[PDB]
Nucleic acid binder design. Structure first.
Length: 206
DNA sequence: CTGTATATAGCG
DNA sequence: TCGCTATAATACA
């Protein structure tokens, strides 16, 4: 150590995976997250894609420093003030990695039928070259990376997909230039009966 | 022969 | 039960 990483690498891809918490501690944090996080509803839970509007197949929330905003798929989200459980996770991640963050996005999947579609994390408000930290609690779910040049009907090349399960209590670091080159998603898994909560920490420009 | 870009439907 | 397809109504450069 101080930590033990599994490195995930391939053309233009640079990420790393590790387990931060044991089962007892991870169960405590999950219960506190279910008690305290406030999720967006109604008009703040609909997006526009290919000209049509949809309610998102999951629940979402945003927290962070004053003044920042976060915009994607026709939806603009404003961040709530930091709370203790979220400050504790942020500080632990900063200590382990040496990086700093001023914003967090939270996604909750109620069972295996809740999911999220393919995309890159590259909006203008992200500081150039900064990393993104992904922390998970609850049921294990499969996570998938796909190369931009390999997408669609007859693509330019065919780079193999990269798949890994994200377990209860784990951290995935996504480093530059991962998000200029690769899309990611969380597909439907019908045999999964229990809920999962995911947190992604970021550096946002004012 | 030729602009690039983005949640569910309807298959197999 | 899992995964590829074809959007669709614009907004750019």
């Amino acid at each position: 150590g101080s930590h033990s990483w599994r490195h995930i690498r391939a053309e233009g891809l640079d990420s790393s995976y590790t387990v931060l918490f044991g089962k007892a501690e991870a169960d405590e944090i999950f219960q506190e997250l279910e008690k305290e996080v406030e999720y967006f509803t109604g008009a703040l839970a609909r997006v526009q894609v290919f000209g049509k509007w949809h309610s998102v197949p999951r629940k979402q929330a945003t927290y962070g420093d004053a003044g920042l905003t976060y915009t994607f798929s026709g939806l603009t989200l404003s961040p709530k003030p930091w709370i203790p459980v979220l400050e504790r996770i942020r500080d632990h991640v900063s200590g382990v990695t040496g990086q700093t963050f001023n914003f967090v996005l939270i996604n909750r999947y109620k069972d295996g039928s809740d999911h999220i579609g393919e995309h890159r994390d590259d909006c203008r408000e992200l500081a150039p070259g900064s990393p993104i930290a992904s922390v998970s609690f609850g049921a294990s779910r499969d996570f998938v990376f796909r190369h931009k040049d390999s997408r669609g009907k007859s693509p330019s090349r065919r780079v193999a997909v990269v798949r890994l399960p994200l377990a209860h209590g784990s951290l995935l670091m996504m480093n530059h230039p991962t998000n200029t080159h690769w899309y990611h998603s969380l597909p439907v898994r019908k045999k999964v009966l229990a809920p999962r909560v995911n947190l992604t920490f970021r550096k946002i420009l004012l």
